[PDB]
Design a protein around this nucleic acid. Structure first.
Ligand SMILES: [Zn+2]
Lengths: 176, 96, 1126, 49, 195
DNA sequence: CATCCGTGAGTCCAGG
DNA sequence: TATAATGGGAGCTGTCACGGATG
């Protein structure tokens, strides 16, 4: 009892709960029961009905049963080629894509200018450029020295002023 | 991050030195979760110890924005910096 | 005529009449082996015709060794018998298509015997789906055609070696007993004249110690081994005496740490060497030991184990060989030659074919299920036990699945051209499990052995670091039931050659004396001269009276392989280039249509047929209907067999396997005849290339250092043009954000880029594709992370709401391009059984009609390689007087250096065959063309001929034929008796000052085309750990600037260049990004940062308890973009 | 120790170096290439730099 | 020989106690990464199964100690912990190496630095470089000694961000993003630009 | 001067 | 998790040349 418990608990490189192990061992059992019964490996559809009556999960279980492979393991023919040397770091940053972003910053700087100080005010407020946060609009007008929510009034005084650098298409390029 | 440093020293590392490096003791052999596929806590990939999986995204999800920088969420103790730290943050195991 | 056996084109051969035996079924190496494994009918009959007493199949054998399986009690007993197969679960073609494995399910009958209850429950058990071999001798594992290569290994037995002492300079003799599996055992002789033994590489002890351990009296030691003073010196220096004291002594040296009982030291000495469980010489292991010692030589093979008699007779063999004796009769055994054995001799080196390789893996799987069997016996109760409850076949299916999937012998079938595949089936690798490593192999294993004659080619082998470790099997060779390599020889009674042929193994031919094939023979069968050329043991040769000739070689081309024999005038090319010339033919690419070579060796026919990549008619009949699609044949008996044509199919190597019908409708055709040939096959002959009009001259430097010049004719007439098919894949999985769906709606893409798709999202058949274009429109849901506050703002202005789906489309890889020649769609919806997680799976096939270009590598059959330097306009080409521009301009400089004037001789015979010829019969038949067969005295324009290796054209006849050359249509002869001709420089107009050697040479297009080989990268993907670029064209990686290359920088002193490459060009995470910005903004290149690789190193040092600190000039430890905390 | 470690017998080199507490002055060709500093040769020397 | 060691522990205040560890450092995750492949299967680094081995045995030691197990049981656990940590630091060094699936010896920590393929000779003395390429070569008798024939296709990818620069320069492309798309589509303009 | 263990054994590309 | 059960099991085989610790 201590073995089979500690076995199911420790052996998987990615841990699966006790019952999940119980399942996979039942699945392998019913497979080998149908195996000698149908002279062939039984379809997922066949396996499902007999034990749990659900086919979608059997596909799922058989993937849980799959044991990982080492990165450090290699290809037999040449002793130099290891798997990990073929894994593209999906994390790392694309050069052009990050640079193109920066050129998009040079265009919004040519937008904070044609706009007024009131106009370039609410822009960086609810979108959060310098902040990094989008503050609720009923707090933005009150945190700003101008009231009567005239900061939402300046908003519409800006939306069309932004059409001009948009009619210059210098922002039109950076969306496609 | 200047490039010119004069010397590079190597020495036998103190047991205390090992602990000064580490942002935490790994206490579980577990790696990630089998369903959530997330680094399980106090494990070999625990985000409390080595840092967040995604940039500025805390583990339990209470903090997900760039606005919180250097904030240590109380619900799961994960500092909010880039996952870029998961390449630099040490761990340690305490042998009995 | 050469091969007047199938219905093949008439290729006239210069020859001495070769009628011993036709080239045996080349694929038989693969065929006959697998037939033994399954115990097929054709095998049992072949066992009968060979007169094999009580034949036991590979599968039958396994079960008998195994059966019966009893526990410690003997209470239970499980036994297996009668293995049988069903019909194959799916036809070959469907397997390749649906990526499933070609197999036929195996059954056995199992009964559970019980000695206590006495009852026996007997039923049939399923064993799994069993991989079957095709008619083409290949396997199909998951839709890819694979081949099991025959493994050259060390045969089990007892081997004797003579080593010379460095100090005493005396002869010391060593023995080594090698089981199929088990414990080691070697008897060696000191310089002290004391015999010693090492057991499983334990320390040395006196050999008498072992004899008194066996039970032999100290008096019998004096009797049996007294005839030497070295054994008398051994029993004398013997430490202890006594049967108890010996066993204890051996025990104490074998397993320290354990209590020595008189009953525990007697037990393991039995177990380590005399039981079927821990020790086992195979059938070969038993047979090879016996032959070497000559005991029970006539008695059939029943003993699978080593014996006491074997131990004694071994030590007797050691001592006699030590003091000079040459022969010895073992008491109870026939006389045996006494000498030191050569481990590399093909009589001691064993070729384990497919059958055994698969068998051994089967035996691994059985012993694993046997373990579960014995565990499932002690658990369940006696009454409720069925074999269905004892048996778990999961480790058996897992051991056969693994072999085909993992092993170094289950190979991707080399499929450039039919020959390439054919040779692949006949490779002889020494590498692989149970064999040796590449670093373990010294220089003796690789070089050419004398015993390879007629068994393994001495020419065919890789150029690389794998040299001499991989070889091809010789033409007429075959494998005998014990895994050795036999070869056909003609029997000579008394100076008279008999047509009776007997196959000889390596060591058997050593005990005889063989005459070379070309030794002159009387019309009856008698030799001409008393003394003839004779082959003898140890590769030594001497003239020997005809009284003493035992056998003679079947053919002059008997030593070579299938590929080697396709090299005309081979005996004129040094082994080095000849080697390449064989290796390279398997690199030839199938052209749009193919020509048979004007010069041949005869082998071109049988190679293509046996290759299996052509279409042969099974039964005689008449072509009832012919189409490009298929051929139907009306047999005589009334039945109809239709052959479906392979049309534009992708090989393993992306070459074009396309078959066309030869026969016209209503043609009467006989069986075995080629009715339709495939890639690199013209009228049923290997057409590896084209016949090209050559000119041997330096031409304005463009052919310098082995480069090649081409006529634009070869580009305008597709002469050197090929088809190349690629296969592209993409699937739609279930993700955590939803599921990937393949749709024609891709974010932010015009209706211009999408123009060539269908309503699904797939490209339409027949459309043309370039790189970058979209093949399969697939989108995936992207993680709902907070979009940029700068792009949020950019989405309010233009008011466009972002989609949660990111473009994951399958675009065409760089370099590739062509026409989309076929779509294959699998859905999980349309019940097509997919792997778990996948929904729609698409394959898009693209063919390329690649005309030959600059940089493409051309080669002849003589190791004369080279890439295309310049392709001149057809008018620039040096041309003959009648206006005909030559095709290919080879550099004269690179001919005499390579010793391969075979290319020259071929060129001569090439011209004679193009123009035709006619010997002068007036005043009789000339003395040069006296030996020339009648059929060649008159030859048409464009006539095909044969120059079989070690036979064929002689330099006399060739010189003669150059004078006979028929004039062109204008009635003028073109080339002279020298073989040269006058050219006109198509550029200057003036004629070239000196006659140039012109003629026709067969040229192949090798699979090294620039369209594949070219590659470059600016930025791209990067390594996950080292953060350096990735590697390879397939990964769009960068080049490597290695340790050697850095030295080249430092030597120059290009410090900045060198740094930049190792820093901002490589693994400086922040640098490469900012270098990109600096370039596109047109600024200056920044100062490089810290290599992320170096950072990794310090973390790898730290993690090894190595306190590494970087100090600044003061002495304080500084941070590396990181901090320390506890 | 950097030059030595990247030459041969790396485990041998490191054990010793870590015991002798050897500091390494990054003033060498091998030494510099590793850390990405300009090599002390050619256009790397201060004279020309 | 003995002094060559002892004198070294004397000199620097470098305690010899360090040779015995009470705590073992754990290398960062991204340096022992665990990755899901396109086949759904996970590929992980060896070090994690070695790390998993030490933890599982170190913890079993804690339970055995706590439970007051006999010395015979506990000592065995300690012995295993030693080989666990040893096989982590340098596998194969003492005894037979720890095999993963396929009787494959697992790469240990020190295995990351050893010999050719190691972190030193393979990743530091020579790296892979951006802005580079390869192709077949061909004699060019026309060229001058200081020239070489660089493939039109090869150059475009080598000078890729350099060409994009002049595309948005001479207004062929409105921004840097479009400039990219012009190059990847191999529009006719770029051949003039790259020249 | 001879044994036993541990460490070396060219580079780049390619592929499965 | 209460019948009684009590010490493992594959080995791996064809290098080569050298220095340092032991003889
Ligand atoms: Zn949290």
């Amino acid at each position: 009892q201590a073995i089979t418990r500690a076995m199911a608990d420790q052996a998987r490189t990615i841990r699966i709960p006790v019952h999940m192990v119980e399942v996979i061992n039942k699945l392998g059992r019913i497979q080998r029961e149908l195996l000698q019964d149908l002279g062939r490996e039984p379809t997922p559809e066949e396996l499902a009905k007999e034990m749990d009556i659900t086919p979608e999960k059997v596909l799922e279980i058989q993937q849980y049963a799959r044991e990982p492979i080492s990165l450090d393991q290699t290809i037999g023919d040449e002793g130099d080629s290891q798997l990990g040397d073929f894994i593209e770091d999906s994390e790392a940053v694309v050069a052009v894509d990050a640079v193109s972003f920066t050129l998009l910053q040079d265009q919004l700087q040519s937008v904070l200018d044609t706009l007024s100080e009131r106009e370039a005010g609410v822009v960086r407020l609810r979108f959060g450029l310098t902040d990094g946060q989008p503050r609720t609009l009923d707090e933005i007008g009150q945190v700003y020295g101008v009231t009567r929510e005239r900061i939402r009034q300046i908003e519409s005084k800006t939306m069309s002023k932004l059409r001009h650098p948009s009619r210059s298409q210098v922002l039109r390029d950076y969306l496609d | 991050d200047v490039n010119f440093f004069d010397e590079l020293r190597i020495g036998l590392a103190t047991a205390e030195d090992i602990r000064q490096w580490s942002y935490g003791e790994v206490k579980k052999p577990e790696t990630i979760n089998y369903r959530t596929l997330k680094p399980e806590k106090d494990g070999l990939f625990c985000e409390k110890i080595f840092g967040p999986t995604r940039d500025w995204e805390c583990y339990c999800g209470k903090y997900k924005r760039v606005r919180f920088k250097g904030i240590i969420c109380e619900r799961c103790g994960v500092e909010v910096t880039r996952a870029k730290v998961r390449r630099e943050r040490m761990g340690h195991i305490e042998l009995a | 005529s050469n091969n007047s056996v199938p219905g093949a084109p008439n290729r006239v051969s210069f020859a001495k009449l070769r009628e011993p035996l036709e080239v045996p079924g080349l694929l038989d190496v693969q065929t006959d082996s697998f037939e033994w494994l399954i115990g097929s009918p054709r095998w049992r009959e072949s066992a009968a015709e060979r007169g094999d007493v009580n034949p036991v199949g590979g599968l039958e054998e396994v079960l008998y060794e195994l059966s019966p399986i009893e526990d410690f009690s003997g209470s239970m007993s499980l036994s297996f018998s009668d293995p049988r197969f069903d019909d194959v679960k799916a036809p070959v073609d469907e397997c390749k298509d649906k990526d499933m494995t070609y197999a036929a399910p195996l059954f056995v009958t199992a009964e559970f015997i019980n000695n206590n209850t006495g009852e026996i429950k007997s039923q049939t058990v399923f064993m799994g789906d069993f991989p079957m071999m095709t008619e083409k001798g290949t396997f199909i594992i998951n839709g890819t055609e694979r081949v099991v290569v025959s493994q050259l290994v060390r045969s089990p037995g007892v081997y004797f070696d003579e080593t010379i002492d460095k100090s005493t300079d005396k002869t010391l003799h060593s023995v080594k007993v090698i089981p199929s599996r088990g414990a080691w055992l070697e008897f060696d002789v000191d310089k002290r004249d004391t015999v010693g033994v090492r057991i499983d590489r334990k320390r040395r002890q006196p050999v008498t110690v072992l004899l008194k351990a066996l039970g032999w009296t100290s008096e019998q030691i004096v009797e049996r081994f007294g005839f030497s003073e070295i054994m008398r010196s051994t029993l004398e220096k013997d430490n202890t005496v006594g049967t108890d004291e010996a066993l204890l002594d051996i025990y104490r040296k074998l397993r320290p740490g354990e209590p020595p009982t008189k009953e525990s030291a007697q037990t393991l000495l039995e177990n380590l060497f005399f039981k079927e469980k821990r020790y086992d010489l195979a059938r070969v292991g038993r047979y090879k030991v016996n032959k070497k010692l000559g005991l029970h030589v006539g008695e059939p093979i029943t003993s699978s184990t080593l014996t006491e008699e074997d131990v004694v007779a071994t030590i007797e063999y050691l001592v006699r060989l030590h003091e000079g004796q040459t022969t010895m009769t073992v008491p109870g055994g026939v006389e045996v030659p006494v000498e030191t054995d050569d481990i590399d001799h093909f009589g001691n080196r064993r070729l384990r074919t497919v059958g055994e390789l698969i068998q051994n893996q089967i035996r691994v799987g059985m012993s694993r299920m046997e373990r579960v069997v014995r565990e499932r016996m002690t658990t369940q109760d006696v009454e409720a036990i069925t074999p269905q409850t004892l048996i778990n076949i999961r480790p058996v299916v897992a051991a056969i699945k693994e072999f085909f999937g993992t092993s170094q012998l289950s190979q991707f079938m080399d499929q450039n051209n039919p020959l390439s595949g054919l040779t692949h089936k006949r490779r002889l690798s020494a590498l692989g499990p149970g064999g040796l490593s590449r670093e373990r192999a010294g220089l003796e294993v690789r070089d050419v052995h004398p015993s390879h004659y007629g068994r393994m080619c001495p020419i065919e082998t890789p150029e690389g670091p794998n040299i001499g470790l991989i070889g091809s099997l010789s033409v007429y060779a075959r494998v005998n039931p014990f895994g050795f390599i036999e070869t056909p020889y003609r029997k000579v009674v008394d100076g008279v050659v008999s047509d009776e042929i007997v196959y000889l193994t390596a060591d058997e031919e050593d005990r005889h004396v063989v005459a070379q094939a070309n030794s002159p023979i009387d019309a009856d069968g008698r030799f001409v001269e008393p003394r003839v050329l004779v082959r003898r043991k140890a590769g030594e040769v001497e003239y020997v009276p005809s009284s003493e000739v035992d056998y003679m070689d079947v053919s002059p081309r008997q030593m070579v392989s299938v590929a080697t024999a396709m090299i005309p005038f081979l005996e004129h090319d040094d082994a080095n280039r000849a080697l390449m010339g064989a290796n390279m033919q398997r690199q030839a690419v199938p052209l749009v249509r193919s020509e048979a070579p004007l010069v041949g060796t005869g082998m071109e026919l049988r190679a293509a047929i046996d290759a299996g990549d052509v279409v042969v008619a099974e039964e005689s009949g008449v072509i009832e209907e012919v189409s490009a699609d298929y051929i139907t044949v009306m047999h005589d008996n009334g039945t109809r067999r239709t052959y479906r044509m392979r049309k534009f199919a992708r090989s393993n190597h992306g070459t074009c396997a396309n078959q066309c019908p030869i026969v016209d409708a209503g043609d009467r055709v006989e069986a075995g005849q080629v009715i339709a040939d495939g890639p690199c096959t013209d009228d049923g002959e290997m057409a590896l290339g084209k016949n090209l009009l050559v000119a041997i001259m330096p031409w304005e430097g463009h052919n310098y250092e082995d480069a090649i010049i081409l006529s634009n004719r070869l580009v305008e007439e597709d002469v050197l043009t090929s088809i190349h098919i690629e296969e592209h894949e993409i699937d739609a999985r279930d993700t955590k954000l939803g599921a990937e769906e393949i749709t024609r709606d891709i974010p932010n893409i015009s209706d211009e880029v999408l123009a060539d798709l269908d309503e699904r999202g797939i490209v339409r058949i027949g459309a043309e594709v370039r790189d970058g274009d979209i093949l399969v429109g697939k989108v995936t849901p992207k993680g709902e992370t907070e979009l940029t506050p700068e792009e949020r703002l950019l989405r309010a202005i233009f008011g466009e709401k972002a989609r949660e789906v990111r473009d994951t489309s399958l675009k065409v890889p760089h370099g590739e391009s062509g026409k989309v020649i076929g779509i294959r769609v699998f859905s999980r919806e349309d019940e097509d059984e997919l792997p778990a997680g996948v929904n729609e799976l698409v394959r898009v096939y693209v063919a390329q009609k690649r005309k030959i270009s600059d940089g493409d590598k051309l080669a002849g059959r003589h190791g004369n390689k080279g890439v295309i330097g310049k392709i001149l306009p057809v008018e620039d080409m040096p041309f003959l007087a009648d206006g005909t521009p030559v095709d290919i301009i080879l550099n004269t400089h690179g001919v005499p250096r390579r010793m391969n004037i075979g290319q020259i001789l071929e060129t001569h015979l090439g011209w004679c065959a193009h123009s035709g010829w006619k010997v002068d019969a007036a005043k009789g038949v000339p003395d040069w063309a006296a030996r020339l067969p009648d059929e060649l005295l008159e030859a048409q324009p464009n006539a095909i001929v044969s120059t079989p290796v070690f036979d064929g054209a002689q330099e006399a006849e060739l010189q003669g034929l150059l004078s006979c050359t028929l004039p062109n249509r204008d009635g003028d002869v073109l080339v002279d008796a020298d073989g040269k001709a006058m050219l006109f420089d198509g550029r200057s107009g003036e004629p070239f000052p000196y006659p140039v050697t012109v003629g026709y040479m067969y040229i192949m297009k090798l699979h090294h085309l620039v369209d594949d080989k070219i590659h470059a990268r600016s930025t791209g993907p990067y390594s996950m750990i080292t953060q350096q670029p990735l590697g390879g064209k397939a990964q769009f990686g960068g080049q490597r600037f290695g340790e050697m290359e850095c030295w080249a920088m430092q030597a120059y002193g290009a410090a900045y260049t060198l740094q930049e490459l190792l820093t901002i060009k490589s693994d400086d995470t922040v640098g490469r990004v900012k270098v990109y910005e600096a370039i596109v903004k047109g600024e200056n290149i920044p100062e490089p940062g810290i290599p992320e690789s170096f950072k990794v190193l310090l973390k790898e040092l730290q993690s090894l308890c190595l306190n590494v600190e970087v100090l600044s000039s003061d002495g304080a430890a500084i941070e590396l973009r990181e901090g320390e905390d506890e | 120790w950097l030059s030595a470690a990247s030459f041969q017998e790396t485990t041998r080199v490191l054990t010793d170096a870590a015991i002798n507490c050897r500091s390494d002055k990054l003033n060498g060709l091998k030494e510099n290439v590793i850390i990405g500093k300009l090599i002390p040769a050619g256009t790397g020397i201060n004279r020309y730099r | 020989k003995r002094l060559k060691v002892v004198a070294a522990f004397q000199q620097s205040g470098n305690s010899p106690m360090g040779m015995v560890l009470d705590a073992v450092p754990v290398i960062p995750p991204e340096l022992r990464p665990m990755v899901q492949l396109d086949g759904g299967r996970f590929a992980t680094s060896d070090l994690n199964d070695l790390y998993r081995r030490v933890i599982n045995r170190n913890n079993r030691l804690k339970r055995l100690i706590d439970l007051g197990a006999p010395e015979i049981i506990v000592n065995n656990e300690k012995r295993m912990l030693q080989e666990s940590v040893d096989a982590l630091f340098d596998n194969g060094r003492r005894g037979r190496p720890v095999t993963g699936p396929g009787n494959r010896p697992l790469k240990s920590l020190s295995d990351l630095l050893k010999g050719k393929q190691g972190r030193f000779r393979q990743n530091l003395l020579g790296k892979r470089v951006d802005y580079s390429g390869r192709s077949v070569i061909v004699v060019g008798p026309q060229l001058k000694l200081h020239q070489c024939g660089l493939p039109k296709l090869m150059a475009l990818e080598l000078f890729k961000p350099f060409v994009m620069k002049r595309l948005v320069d001479l207004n062929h492309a409105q921004n840097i993003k479009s400039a990219k798309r012009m190059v990847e589509r191999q529009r006719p303009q770029v051949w003039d630009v790259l020249e």
